[PDB]
Amino acid sequence: GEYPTVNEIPVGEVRLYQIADGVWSHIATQSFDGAVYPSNGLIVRDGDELLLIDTAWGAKNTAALLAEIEKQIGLPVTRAVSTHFHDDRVGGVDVLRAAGVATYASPSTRRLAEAEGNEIPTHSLEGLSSSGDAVRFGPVELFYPGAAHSTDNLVVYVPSANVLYGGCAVHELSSTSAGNVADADLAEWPTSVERIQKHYPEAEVVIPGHGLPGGLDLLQHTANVVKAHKN
Numbered sequence: 001g002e003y004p005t006v007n008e009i010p011v012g013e014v015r016l017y018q019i020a021d022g023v024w025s026h027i028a029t030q031s032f033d034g035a036v037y038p039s040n041g042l043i044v045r046d047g048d049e050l051l052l053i054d055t056a057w058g059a060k061n062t063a064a065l066l067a068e069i070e071k072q073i074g075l076p077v078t079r080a081v082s083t084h085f086h087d088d089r090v091g092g093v094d095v096l097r098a099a100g101v102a103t104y105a106s107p108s109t110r111r112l113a114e115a116e117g118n119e120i121p122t123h124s125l126e127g128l129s130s131s132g133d134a135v136r137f138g139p140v141e142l143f144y145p146g147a148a149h150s151t152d153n154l155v156v157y158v159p160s161a162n163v164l165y166g167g168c169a170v171h172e173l174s175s176t177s178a179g180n181v182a183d184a185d186l187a188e189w190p191t192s193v194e195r196i197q198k199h200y201p202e203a204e205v206v207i208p209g210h211g212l213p214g215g216l217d218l219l220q221h222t223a224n225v226v227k228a229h230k231n
């Protein structure tokens with residue numbers, strides 16, 4: 001009943017983890033450049049429907065996600081938000097779009113996904129283009145903290161449960177490096193994390209884009225590992 005780790009999930013299977021009432025994470029694994037990585041997303045109950053945050057990193061993983069949701073929860077996924085343009089966030093959007101899910105991302109994410117050759121969410125989320133912006137989306141708040149892991153990364157807060165989903169701007173406590181920094185801004189990242197800390201001081205659970213949830217310490221730890229990576 002502990003949170004599931006990379007070696008416990010074969011590539012292609014998806015597990016769900018109950019975070020709070022009406023809030024789950026989803027965990028899947030994928031191969032990239034010859035190594036296997038876990039990744040997280042979020043599911044938030046929206047009355048008799050579900051809001052999905054992020055794909056399960058690939059088409060077959062995302063199909064498996066939908067099946068796992070049907071088995072474990074049994075409510076329809078009606079909308080999905082992708083929190084940046086990388087394949088661990090948008091790979092699977094075409095599966096979602098063929099299963100009746102309306103897919104959303106910021107215009108910045110949509111442009112970057114298109115330029116990269118990744119799958120492209122259908123609908124643009126306006127109101128998020130300046131750092132510190134926040135908008136409501138069903139049962140969550142979407143927040144743009146500034147450039148961090150990527151220039152487009154969004155953060156999601158579930159106010160009913162004080163759950164902060166940091167996405168790939170936030171690392172797990174065991175991390176020793178800042179993950180895949182190919183598209184990152186290591187210089188701005190600590191400032192962006194500080195904006196998150198200031199905006200969401202009552203967060204009780206913090207979920208990283210990859211690895212184990214914890215508390216607010218994940219934010220400071222992230223700042224620490226990024227500053228040492230830049231060095």
Ligand SMILES: C[C@H](OC(=O)CCCN)c1cccc2c(-c3ccc(CS(C)(=O)=O)c(Cl)c3)c(C(=O)O)[nH]c12
Nearest residue numbers: 032037086087088168171175176177178179180182210
């Ligand atoms: C699909 C994604 O592509 C990119 O990001 C740039 C693609 C450029 N064409 C990706 C592919 C493969 C791996 C990742 C990782 C990752 C996460 C955690 C760790 C452990 S640790 C202790 O370093 O935190 C590591 Cl090693 C990597 C992350 C992330 O950091 O969000 N994104 C990853």
Ligand SMILES: [Zn+2]
Nearest residue numbers: 084086149168
């Ligand atoms: Zn990424």
Ligand SMILES: [Zn+2]
Nearest residue numbers: 088168209210
């Ligand atoms: Zn990531």
